[PDB]
Amino acid sequence: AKKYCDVTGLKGFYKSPTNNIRYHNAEIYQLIVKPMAPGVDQEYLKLRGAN
Amino acid sequence: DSPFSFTTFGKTTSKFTDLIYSSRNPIKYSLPRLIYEDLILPNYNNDVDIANKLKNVKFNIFNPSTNYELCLFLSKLTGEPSLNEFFRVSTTPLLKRVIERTNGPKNTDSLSFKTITQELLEVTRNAPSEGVMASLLNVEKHAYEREYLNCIQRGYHPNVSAPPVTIEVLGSSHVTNSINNELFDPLISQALSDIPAITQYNMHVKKGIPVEDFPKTGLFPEPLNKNFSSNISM
């Protein structure tokens, strides 16, 4: 299966090891993936069913 | 006391520990992708392979399909019972002609006879000591055993030891496989080594492979002493 960024739907290059969400590049990582509240990750990964 | 290692390898910045050979040369010859793609490797827009066939196969003068008279002439000259041997001689490199040389039989009705020097050589293969031909043909080993050369020490060591210069091409795996095949050719590296004995016993008895189907091994020349086999001195 093809891998994609969970935020924008772009092509996913990296997966953050703390919370296991794929992202595209630096800005989406820094302003989305790092400072997000807990409980958002489980509804982000519910879309592809990875929880 | 060792030669200086002019190389860069994986060093540790300190149920088993695996060590892999990773010695490389510090000098790197950086080459672009365009030259290697457009002049070495064939593609649709160049004619490397077509010219190679047209120069090596079609217009080869030892082709039996076109120069059968020349093949018969050279077969009468050499007395070799295969007409395709000249094609196989002319189209493989030198060391490939070296390491699988087989002492095949040649017919008597030919012109390549036994040279008197070659007959003098061939007499003294399995001849033992105190024979007149063997003693006249074994001067150098007599000088080896009389001058006590097998227990002599080593006085000279090289100062720098370096690997061959690594060529790098960024963005291509074919160059990496080709370079790994050229540096670590398994046929030549098996010719420059030997098979372990338990491995041989697994070849012959436990797997049924006969002895004459083995890859050729043990072509490395022996050093003069046990001391001369290495550059590291204790």
């Binding site: 891998k3 | 392979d49 080869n60 003068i61 120069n67 030198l94 050229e182």
Partner: protein, 435 residues
């Protein structure tokens, strides 16, 4: 953008259908009779009937001998072989000089081979080999962006496929006529089996799996000689590091030449090949030793020898290798009997001015008429080449002062800055310690 180096304004001999030259045509100014001789030699060469015909064109220096040879090469075309050569090149340290002369002779006889190219490339979807320890055949299915196509293949090709480490999902390159196997890499569809992988991922080929292409192969006789005369042996297709032993050139025996001639003769009459003889051009032929001049005699009488063009700019000069043989143009009287001598007259003022204007045109420089007359008087006073080589410093010194056009003062500045041979000799004679 574009480069010029004392040439490339020469496009041809500038002749009409009757073989008469115009005054200024093809980049040539003046020099009628030598151009007629060159056109007749071009027609004789295009007749494709003769072996060993020789031509020597002689004259003073800076007269256009090399320009005439290049005009011959341009009028003949790029299909016919043309081998430029300096006479000093025949002195090699690896083989004898007569050997190198024979290779430069046989470099001027070309061939035209009609060949085809068929190529299979694309996605590997099936690798199923079958036996009857020894495989019988392998069936490989190839896939591209315009459809799939399965093939049957022989185990000899399967050995190269195994050598190339080809598995399911790779993009390969199969040339059916030669048997070449090339691995490009893994597909873009298999890029997500791992996050980090050591393989390179390429997209699918956008064309069809099977492509056909007609090609024309040109080889000379010297390539066929050197292909059968390798002393070490044959080489593989991919050789990035050379053999451990150095192969040097060896003298090639006449027997191999006889067999190569037999093979080419057996291939010509079937219509496969087309024989094209060409030109061996030797410049500065006075530099040759007498033994090369004697072997030139025997080499010119061969049945496959090309048309040889020589040039010289000497007078009553002793040929090298001798002490008291005064001969015209540095050619001995034995070889000069078999030659045909074309003279080359020098130029006057107006043709030198026309040449200066023509070369200023091709270098995209704009000169006034007053500077043009000064450059013409400079060329007649000093040398034609000295007026030739001051054009680009004049352009630089005009461009320095934000000008696109040459004035007289830039020519005077370049006159003061750069010297010719005679002013340098005058400074050399009136000097104290080694200029």
């Amino acid at each position: 953008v574009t480069r010029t180096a004392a040439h490339t304004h020469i496009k041809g001999l500038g002749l009409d259908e009757s073989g008469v030259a115009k005054r200024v045509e093809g980049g040539f100014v003046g020099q009628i009779e030598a151009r007629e001789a060159c056109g007749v030699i071009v027609d004789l060469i295009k007749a494709k009937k003769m072996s060993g015909r020789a031509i020597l064109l002689a004259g003073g220096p800076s007269t256009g001998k090399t320009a005439l040879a290049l005009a011959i090469s341009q009028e003949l075309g790029p299909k016919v072989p043309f081998c430029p050569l300096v006479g000093s090149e025949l002195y090699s340290v690896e083989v004898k000089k007569t050997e190198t002369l024979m290779e430069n002779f046989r470099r001027a006889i070309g061939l035209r081979i009609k060949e085809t190219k068929e190529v299979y490339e694309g996605e590997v979807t099936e690798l199923t080999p079958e036996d009857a320890k020894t495989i019988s055949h392998v069936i490989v299915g190839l896939k591209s962006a315009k459809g799939t196509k399965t093939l049957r293949l022989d185990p000899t090709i399967y050995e190269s496929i195994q050598r190339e480490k080809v598995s399911i999902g790779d993009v390969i390159y199969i040339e059916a006529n030669t048997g070449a196997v090339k691995r490009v890499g893994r597909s873009d569809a298999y890029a997500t089996e791992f996050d980090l992988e050591t393989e390179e991922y390429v997209p699918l080929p956008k064309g069809e799996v099977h492509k056909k292409k007609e090609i024309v192969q040109d080889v000379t006789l010297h390539d066929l000689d050197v292909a059968n005369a390798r002393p070490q042996g044959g080489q593989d297709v991919i050789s990035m590091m050379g053999q451990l032993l150095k192969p040097k050139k060896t003298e090639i025996t006449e027997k191999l030449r006889q067999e190569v001639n037999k093979v080419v003769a057996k291939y010509i009459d079937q219509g496969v090949a087309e024989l094209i003889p060409g030109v061996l051009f030797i410049d500065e032929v006075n530099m040759l030793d007498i033994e090369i001049f004697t072997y030139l005699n025997k080499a010119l009488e061969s049945n496959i020898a090309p048309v040889v063009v020589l040039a010289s700019n000497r007078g009553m000069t002793t040929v090298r290798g001798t002490e008291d043989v005064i001969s015209p143009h540095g050619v001995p009287p034995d070889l000069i009997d078999r030659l045909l001598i074309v003279r080359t007259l020098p130029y006057d003022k107006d043709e030198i001015r026309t040449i200066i204007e023509r070369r200023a045109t091709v270098e995209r420089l704009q000169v006034e008429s007053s500077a043009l007359d000064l450059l013409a008087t400079m060329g007649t006073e000093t040398s034609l080449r000295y007026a030739l080589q001051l054009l680009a410093p004049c352009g630089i010194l005009a461009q320095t002062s934000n000008r696109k056009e040459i004035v007289v003062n830039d020519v005077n500045e370049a006159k003061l800055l750069f010297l010719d041979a005679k002013r340098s000799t005058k400074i050399l004679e009136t000097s104290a310690n080694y200029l």
